[PDB]
Amino acid sequence: DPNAQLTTAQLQTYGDLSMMEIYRNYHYAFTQQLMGCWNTTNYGGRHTLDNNEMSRIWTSFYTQSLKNIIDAQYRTAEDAEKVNINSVLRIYRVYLMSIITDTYGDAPFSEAGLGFLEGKFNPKYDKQEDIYNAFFLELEDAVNKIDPTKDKVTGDLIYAGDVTKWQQLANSLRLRFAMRISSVNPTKAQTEFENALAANGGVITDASSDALIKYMTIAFSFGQEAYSDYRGNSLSQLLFGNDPANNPSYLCSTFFNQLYNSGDPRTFKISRCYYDGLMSATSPDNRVDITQEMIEKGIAFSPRDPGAYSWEPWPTGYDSDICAELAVNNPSVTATMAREVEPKLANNFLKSDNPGVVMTSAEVKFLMAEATVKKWNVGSVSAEDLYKQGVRAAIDFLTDNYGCTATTDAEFDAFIQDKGAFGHTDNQKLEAINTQAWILHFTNPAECWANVRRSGYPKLKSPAEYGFGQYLTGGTEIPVRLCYPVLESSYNKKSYNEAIERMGGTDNWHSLLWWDTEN
Numbered sequence: 001d002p003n004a005q006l007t008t009a010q011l012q013t014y015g016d017l018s019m020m021e022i023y024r025n026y027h028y029a030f031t032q033q034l035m036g037c038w039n040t041t042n043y044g045g046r047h048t049l050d051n052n053e054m055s056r057i058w059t060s061f062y063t064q065s066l067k068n069i070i071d072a073q074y075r076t077a078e079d080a081e082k083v084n085i086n087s088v089l090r091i092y093r094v095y096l097m098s099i100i101t102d103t104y105g106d107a108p109f110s111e112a113g114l115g116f117l118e119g120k121f122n123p124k125y126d127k128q129e130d131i132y133n134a135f136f137l138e139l140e141d142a143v144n145k146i147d148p149t150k151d152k153v154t155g156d157l158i159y160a161g162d163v164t165k166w167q168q169l170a171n172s173l174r175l176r177f178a179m180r181i182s183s184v185n186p187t188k189a190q191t192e193f194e195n196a197l198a199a200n201g202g203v204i205t206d207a208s209s210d211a212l213i214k215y216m217t218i219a220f221s222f223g224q225e226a227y228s229d230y231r232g233n234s235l236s237q238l239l240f241g242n243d244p245a246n247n248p249s250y251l252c253s254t255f256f257n258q259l260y261n262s263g264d265p266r267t268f269k270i271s272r273c274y275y276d277g278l279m280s281a282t283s284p285d286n287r288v289d290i291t292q293e294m295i296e297k298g299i300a301f302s303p304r305d306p307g308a309y310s311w312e313p314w315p316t317g318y319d320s321d322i323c324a325e326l327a328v329n330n331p332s333v334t335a336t337m338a339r340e341v342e343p344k345l346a347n348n349f350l351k352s353d354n355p356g357v358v359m360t361s362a363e364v365k366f367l368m369a370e371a372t373v374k375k376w377n378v379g380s381v382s383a384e385d386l387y388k389q390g391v392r393a394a395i396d397f398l399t400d401n402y403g404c405t406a407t408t409d410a411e412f413d414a415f416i417q418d419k420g421a422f423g424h425t426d427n428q429k430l431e432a433i434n435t436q437a438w439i440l441h442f443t444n445p446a447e448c449w450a451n452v453r454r455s456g457y458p459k460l461k462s463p464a465e466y467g468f469g470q471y472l473t474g475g476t477e478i479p480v481r482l483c484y485p486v487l488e489s490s491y492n493k494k495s496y497n498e499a500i501e502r503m504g505g506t507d508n509w510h511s512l513l514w515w516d517t518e519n
């Protein structure tokens with residue numbers, strides 16, 4: 001059933017426990033948002049190339065999510081009484097394919113998943129440039145073929161079948177991809193962006209049309225059954241951890257310092273310092289929050305520089321009154337804190353029912369701001385006002401979707417009028433926009449990495465510059481793509497050879513993707 005296929009594809013987006021490892025291992029290190037967890041530091045933190053780890057997106061999407069949606073799109077393409085489910089499938093196929101190409105570059109798309117349908121195996125790799133062409137034509141046509149008088153969409157965990165919102169999402173995705181190609185093809189970028197604003201339905205203009213995959217409140221399990229269970233947010237499960245006491249989600253200094261040093265209200269909504277001596281083995285219950293105690297006693301937060309483990313360098317701790325008091329009736333507790341002074345990801349982001357973020361109004365505000373700085377014709381609102389509106393929506397996103405404490409007007413105004421302020425020069429504005437997007441995209445690591453590479457903001461430095469150069473087996477520079485699966489070079493040989501021929505025979509994670517014009 002086409003509608004059922006949509007449900008599963010959507011669940012499989014953040015629900016696949018197997019695939020979400022790639023984000024913990026590589027992405028969150030490359031974006032320098034998490035660091036210290038063994039998996040994050042070893043792989044992305046110290047540029048350890050592992051083909052199995054790098055091919056998780058490819059394998060997962062081409063064997064499950066995208067394969068299914070391609071099949072469902074195909075069976076509904078020629079049926080005028082199924083134009084809504086068809087259009088929706090086409091929009092989601094674009095979204096899922098965007099994650100593939102923004103990871104690896106050239107990939108099967110046009111010929112993808114046509115094994116049993118057309119008897120066409122060994123699909124060719126479409127050029128990234130052509131994939132992006134296809135994204136604009138597919139989203140434009142999907143938007144124009146939507147018709148609320150036709151079929152009802154019954155399996156949709158994002159908008160519950162509201163096809164008007166799917167129009168808004170499609171046109172917002174056009175905005176995203178327009179701005180992605182804004183360095184490599186400036187004129188096309190501008191046209192596509194302007195066309196998207198003018199299209200039927202418009203774009204996502206406030207949070208009520210944010211594209212969030214709803215996930216279920218379900219227990220974290222790492223047993224075998226869990227790897228075919230997509231009902232819960234598996235990225236959140238992983239950031240809690242298979243090894244949650246030894247290897248939780250410690251924040252990277254780049255991200256923590258950005259928040260802390262800018263007086264960002266979200267510093268201690270996103271991160272806290274926890275003692276986990278009594279923490280549950282399979283959920284983030286019974287953690288001792290020591291953040292306020294550390295501030296009162298004047299204890300230095302010690303976030304992990306890129307390349308550092310939680311244990312290297314070993315931090316300076318203190319003796320906790322809170323933990324000493326808790327030790328009286330809980331004798332297993334110790335009062336001496338060590339790695340607890342290293343900020344960790346807040347409990348709010350460690351829930352199975354955390355949404356799977358596809359795209360937000362906050363991002364749209366930022367794309368619009370950047371468009372206005374580039375002097376595109378995108379309306380009457382000032383860049384600054386758009387920027388201000390995006391930062392606000394990005395702060396409020398945490399309140400509305402993760403039950404974080406509300407940020408007051410006065411708190412927001414203090415931040416935005418000081419170190420959160422918009423730039424004056426073009427470069428300062430682009431920096432501010434894309435640094436702020438960086439923070440927003442923390443729960444959308446696919447998009448977070450794509451935009452850091454594309455925008456060049458924030459300016460990140462190699463782990464080498466933090467004293468970890470001796471461990472970098474895969475080279476100095478932060479990888480800007482992932483290499484193709486060995487499976488592909490083995491069993492899709494002709495198509496693979498054709499693809500690597502276009503990169504001078506290389507298949508290297510330091511080769512810039514077509515939309516990424518500089519390191």
Ligand SMILES: OC[C@H]1O[C@@H](O[C@H]2[C@H](O)[C@@H](O)[C@H](O[C@H]3[C@H](O)[C@@H](O)[C@H](O[C@@H]4[C@@H](O)[C@H](O[C@H]5[C@H](O)[C@@H](O)[C@H](O[C@H]6[C@H](O)[C@@H](O)[C@H](O[C@@H]7[C@@H](O)[C@H](O)O[C@H](CO)[C@H]7O)O[C@@H]6CO)O[C@@H]5CO)O[C@H](CO)[C@H]4O)O[C@@H]3CO)O[C@@H]2CO)[C@H](O)[C@@H](O)[C@@H]1O
Nearest residue numbers: 017018019021038039224227242243246247309311312314
């Ligand atoms: O000096 C002053 C003070 O010192 C104090 O002592 C300190 C000391 O100073 C420190 O140096 C020391 O540091 C220790 C630290 O305590 C240890 O925790 C650390 O241990 C790491 C260890 O975590 C790590 O383990 C990982 C394994 O290596 C991996 O193989 C394993 O991989 C997992 C993976 O995590 C998981 O995701 C994966 O899932 C599979 C999926 O991929 C697949 O798709 O599906 C299948 C099922 O279908 C899944 O299984 O599975 C794999 C398993 O195959 O992850 C492990 C982590 O989760 O290994 C590292 C090296 O191998 C270890 O180092 O080591 C540090 C040292 O290096 O700590 C002490 C304190 O104890 C003094 O006490 C003070 O007095 C002094 O003042």
Ligand SMILES: [Mg+2]
Nearest residue numbers: 453516518519
């Ligand atoms: Mg770049």
